[PDB]
Amino acid sequence: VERTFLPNGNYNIKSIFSGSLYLNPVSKSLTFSNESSANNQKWNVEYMAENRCFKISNVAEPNKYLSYDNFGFISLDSLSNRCYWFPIKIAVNTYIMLSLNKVNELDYAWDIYDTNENILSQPLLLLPNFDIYNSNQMFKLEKI
Amino acid sequence: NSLNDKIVTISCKADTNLFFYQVAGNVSLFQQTRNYLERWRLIYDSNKAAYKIKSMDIHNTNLVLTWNAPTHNISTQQDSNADNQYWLLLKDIGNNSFIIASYKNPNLVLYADTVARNLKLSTLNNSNYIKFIIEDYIISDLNNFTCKISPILDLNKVVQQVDVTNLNVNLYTWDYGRNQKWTIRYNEEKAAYQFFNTILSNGVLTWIFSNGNTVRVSSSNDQNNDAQYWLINPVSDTDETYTITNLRDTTKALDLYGGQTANGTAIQVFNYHGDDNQKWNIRNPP
Amino acid sequence: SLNDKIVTISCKADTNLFFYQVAGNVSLFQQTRNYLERWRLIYDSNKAAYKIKSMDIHNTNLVLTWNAPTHNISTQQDSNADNQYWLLLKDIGNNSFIIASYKNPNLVLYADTVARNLKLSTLNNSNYIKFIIEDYIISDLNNFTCKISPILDLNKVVQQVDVTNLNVNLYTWDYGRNQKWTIRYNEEKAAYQFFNTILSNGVLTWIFSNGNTVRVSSSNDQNNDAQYWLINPVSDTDETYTITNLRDTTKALDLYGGQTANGTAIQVFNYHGDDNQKWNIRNPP
């Protein structure tokens, strides 16, 4: 049953810089790649009532979740407090994804670096968030 | 060590005409003022390997560049030696610019908002908006400054080239003529300055060491002449007073003959003793 | 300023580990004093960034490359790509460098000293992202304990006569401590001193107050710019140098006449490019 603004289920994850690039793991990094139509580009979103946050697992590796490491990178790892994500919906299915935890006593969010709106081969990082206007921190969650 | 205790100006690589400017706890970006409002002392902590950036404000004497965590805003606040008051000065070699990163959180660096004319913290990128020019305040104030030069014995008189064809240099009453104005340029390679008289394009103040102590304007297309270059040393407790020594022999100082203040009195070089006839006011032409 | 300089790069977190290249793989390894740990910095002025190219003699076209989006750093063929460019940020006062990716300047080199390789990190205050970048000659010679031979006879060496006689002459190699020199670099003076290992504070000095006399003196004459020397690599050699004094930089170090015999005195001489002013600096075997 629905508890929030974002229903449980399988999503593609995209950056607002490109409607044709899809979040998937490459080695131990997360990156946006050409549509593969495969499970590694499918993300299971699950609301957690106790913390009012979301955990997001990879469909091809259902016991691995989006998390972050000690080097500023988003990662795919087993469940832990680092796997809880606090979205801010800023448009139809555009979100800023904050870490539930304060990090270095700031809000930290997914962040993808662009060179003139090109994000090819960039790893998804976890960087400080100050507001809802940073394009590099805006992501689309598409139900699919 | 090399920057500790140094008083600097800080301008934007994105807009070199905009300088960090401080008043009453507010930091903004403003045109060059050549005064304490745009001067900052760098204070090194060896343990943190980081710097405080202290305003030389004359009324509030303990204000330092402060990141207002958790926002991205910058201000100047009373110095409490806090981590959010410390900065890593990272020199981008070859670019002659600095990225200035928060010591509290080095993910974040100063970013110049040239349209709002203020500073904020930002994550990194390859633009010039996060690159800054940090310069000794004397060099900053004097470099490309068009000025008139007066002995402190007579501030109504100025060092002048006699005219466009007479390259001699003498003391004379100030009459607003271009022959009485000099544009100072700093040479980074030589770590010294040239004085270009504004009545010519390539005429620089020069010690004619082939005629004893004589100084004259000569052409600057004579490039390996140290005698054309000068060190400009501020006299303490003054805003506009300098000693001026020659790059060839730094014991040789710009000298007003005899301390005589009559029109036509010779300007020359002479052994440095630091008396009043070797002290010069470099000033805005009114 | 740094363009085309050949350097070693070592870790501030472990100053005994250097960037090391073989066959496309980069690792952190002990000092080798050879081309496997040498890199040419190549500046692109428009990018304000550098390529970092291995001086490997077999493949001459390998540059430090970030294999985006992974955490892995390797050497790949130079294709002038953004993941082959690096911002060299000198941390002033700390005398070290942060090395940031041009492709994503939020990411900088991180020394994994336990795994002995490189990875990436966002900026922080740890020593693991700081690096010491040094001209390779300085890097090789600084704190190097050596023996010094004229190329005219690689069997004799420059020595202090003994612990009481501070004269300096040529003599046959016998592994004596008086026949070995510990080279120390003075960053402030941008020059070197040769410490004899039979003394504590005895350095090689030009006694200009006997004209051409070189000899060991104490370094208890704190400011004396004849206790200092410049060392210059003879072109296309491995171990061959010229040694010039800091006071007069045309006063090169000189083997008398070219006399390759025992007790031939050691002196300065006006630099004439010649073979009795050339020297081999080696590890004592």
Ligand SMILES: CC(=O)N[C@@H]1[C@@H](O)[C@H](O[C@@H]2O[C@H](CO)[C@H](O)[C@H](O)[C@H]2O)[C@@H](CO)O[C@@H]1O
């Ligand atoms: C008329 C006369 O010669 N008076 C001299 C002063 O000139 C002289 O002052 C010095 O003059 C030289 C000129 O080459 C330099 O300007 C120098 O800096 C001056 O000190 C003094 C010396 O003390 O003696 C007379 O008064």
Ligand SMILES: CC(=O)N[C@@H]1[C@@H](O)[C@H](O[C@@H]2O[C@H](CO)[C@H](O)[C@H](O)[C@H]2O)[C@@H](CO)O[C@@H]1O
């Ligand atoms: C006995 C004698 O003087 N023979 C000379 C050599 O000296 C000379 O070699 C030079 O000698 C000077 C003296 O200190 C320098 O060491 C210099 O570096 C040497 O080149 C040669 C020159 O070819 O000629 C004689 O043999």
